[PDB]
Structures are given as structure tokens and as C-alpha cells.
Amino acid sequence: TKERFVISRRRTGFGDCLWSLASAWSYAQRTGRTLVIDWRGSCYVEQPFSNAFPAFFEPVEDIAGVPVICDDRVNQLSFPGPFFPRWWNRPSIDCINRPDEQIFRERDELTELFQAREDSEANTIVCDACLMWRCSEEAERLIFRNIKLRSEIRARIDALYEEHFSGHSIIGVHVRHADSELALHQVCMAIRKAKALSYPKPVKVFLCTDSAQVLDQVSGLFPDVFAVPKAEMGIEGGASALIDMYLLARCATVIRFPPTSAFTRYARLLVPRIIEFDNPGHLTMIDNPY
Numbered sequence: 001t002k003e004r005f006v007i008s009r010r011r012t013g014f015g016d017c018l019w020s021l022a023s024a025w026s027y028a029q030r031t032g033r034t035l036v037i038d039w040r041g042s043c044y045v046e047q048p049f050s051n052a053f054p055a056f057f058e059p060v061e062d063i064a065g066v067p068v069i070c071d072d073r074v075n076q077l078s079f080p081g082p083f084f085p086r087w088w089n090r091p092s093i094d095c096i097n098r099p100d101e102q103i104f105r106e107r108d109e110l111t112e113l114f115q116a117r118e119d120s121e122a123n124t125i126v127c128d129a130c131l132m133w134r135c136s137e138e139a140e141r142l143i144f145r146n147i148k149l150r151s152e153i154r155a156r157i158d159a160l161y162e163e164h165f166s167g168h169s170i171i172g173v174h175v176r177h178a179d180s181e182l183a184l185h186q187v188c189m190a191i192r193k194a195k196a197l198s199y200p201k202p203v204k205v206f207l208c209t210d211s212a213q214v215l216d217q218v219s220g221l222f223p224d225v226f227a228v229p230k231a232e233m234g235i236e237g238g239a240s241a242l243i244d245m246y247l248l249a250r251c252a253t254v255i256r257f258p259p260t261s262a263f264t265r266y267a268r269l270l271v272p273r274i275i276e277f278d279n280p281g282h283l284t285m286i287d288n289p290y
């Protein structure tokens with residue numbers, strides 16, 4: 001009997017990476033495989049063969065009973081074939097071309113596998129597609145509770161929490177960016193809706209946006225708006241993303257613009273009230289006690 005594996009490969013934003021990871025974990029758990037977290041080629045890391053996982057999270061060798069490999073051993077180990085999806089059995093020269101259509105086919109093939117009664121006979125499952133929505137919300141919560149941010153990032157979160165969140169009810173606003181005038185108008189309406197709700201503590205607005213113009217505009221339109229200020233630059237970008245993602249999950253209400261963004265998925269799982277645009281033009285509120 002030989003060790004078998006599920007490899008979770010993802011190189012996009014962390015919301016996507018961590019949700020896709022939960023899907024891979026859940027299959028590994030179901031089928032008695034080792035999970036490999038392979039974030040080589042991450043958008044936040046300049047070096048293309050460095051596993052990005054340990055640049056942001058502490059080493060983990062086990063997640064809820066599933067053995068994990070999450071470090072530079074991905075560059076030393078030969079993960080055994082045959083592989084699934086079957087594209088991964090092709091010669092390397094044939095794997096140079098990996099268009100979106102192949103990636104989307106593999107999403108579908110993995111989805112089918114995950115739903116099937118029988119485990120695959122492949123010794124290694126390679127997950128290198130978006131696996132958002134491909135697991136239970138419980139699997140997603142389990143991931144957030146069983147990996148830990150590096151201490152330098154936690155310390156920043158802890159400082160910001162003490163400075164801004166503590167003693168207050170925070171409305172978190174995620175704005176992922178004639179068109180722009182409307183959209184700013186809609187975000188303003190969402191904030192006004194959120195502010196008209198009752199909170200137990202005095203209200204502040206936490207803005208997370210990837211745009212400078214949005215911060216200046218929203219801050220000029222509402223009181224008590226704050227934000228977290230902004231190779232080495234890739235890692236700082238990643239840290240700043242994680243700080244924002246985690247702090248959003250500590251808000252009393254979160255506004256998701258748009259609610260399709262994985263960035264606010266963690267917040268969506270944890271926060272008591274979520275506001276989003278639905279009937280377009282119209283705002284909906286979700287209660288999540290849970």
C-alpha cells in the first residue's frame with residue numbers, strides 16, 4: 001500500500017486559494033489521501049518555484065486528521081501517477097499549453113469526481129482549477145480554524161483591532177474595483193442602509209478597497225471611515241490582503257461589493273449581517289447568527 005495524494009494548486013487571490021484548499025482537503029479527508037498545498041507561482045511571490053504558503057501561514061503537518069505537505073518539499077518529492085484529471089498524465093512538453101478551457105474542463109471533472117461514490121484509482125489528484133463552491137461551508141470554516149497566519153501578520157491584525165474595532169460596532173465595506181459614478185452611488189446607499197440598523201456599540205466604517213480614489217470619496221462622504229494603510233512589495237501586498245480579509249470577518253455588518261468576490265467569503269461565514277446587491281438595483285440583507 002502506497003501513499004496517495006491530493007494536490008491543491010492555486011495562485012490567485014487568497015479568498016479563492018483558501019476556498020479551493022477546503023475543497024481539496026475535503027476530498028483528501030474522504031479518501032484517505034495526503035494533502036499537498038502547492039502555491040508555487042502565486043501572484044504575491046516574485047520567485048516562481050517558491051511555495052507561497054509558508055510566506056503567509058505557519059507550517060502545518062496535519063489539518064483535522066489529514067496529513068499535509070505545505071512547504072518547499074513540493075520541489076523535492078515526485079508525486080506518484082497515474083494522475084487525475086487525466087491531462088496530467090500527458091508528457092510535460094504537451095502540458096506547456098494549459099488554456100482556460102482546459103482549466104474549466106478540469107473544474108468540471110473534479111466536480112464530478114467529488115460527487116461520485118467511488119474514489120479515483122489515480123494515485124495523485126491534481127487540483128489546479130477554481131474549486132469555489134466545491135465543498136461544504138463546514139470544510140471552509142475548518143480551514144480557517146486550522147491554519148494560522150504568520151505572527152508578523154497576526155500582530156498587525158491585533159494592533160488594528162485594538163485601535164479601531166474594540167469597543168465599537170464595525171460596518172465593513174469591501175469594494176473591489178458613468179459606470180464608476182453609479183457604483184460609488186450604490187456603495188453609498190449600501191453604507192446608509194447598514195448605518196440605519198441598530199448596533200450595540202458606537203458605529204465605525206471599515207473600508208477595504210483596492211482603489212485610492214474610493215477610499216478618499218467614501219471617507220469624504222461618511223464619518224468615522226478608516227482603512228488599513230495600503231519581491232518585498234509582493235509579500236507586503238499579500239499581507240495587506242490577509243489583514244483586510246481577517247478584519248472584515250470581525251465586523252458586525254459586512255457590505256460585499258460584489259458578493260461574488262471570494263475575498264469576503266470568510267466574512268460571509270462569520271459575520272452576523274451581510275448586505276449585498278441582489279433584482280439589480282436592489283439591496284438584500286442576510287442574517288447569519290448562523
Ligand SMILES: Nc1nc2c(ncn2[C@@H]2O[C@H](COP(=O)(O)OP(=O)(O)O)[C@@H](O)[C@H]2O)c(=O)[nH]1
Nearest residue numbers: 013014015016208209210240241244261262263
Ligand atoms: N488589501 C486588499 N486587497 C484586496 C481587496 N480586494 C481585493 N484585493 C486583492 O485582490 C485579490 C482578490 O482575489 P480573491 O480574494 O480571490 O477575491 P475575488 O477575485 O474578488 O473573487 C485579493 O485576495 C487581494 O489580493 C481589498 O479590499 N484589500
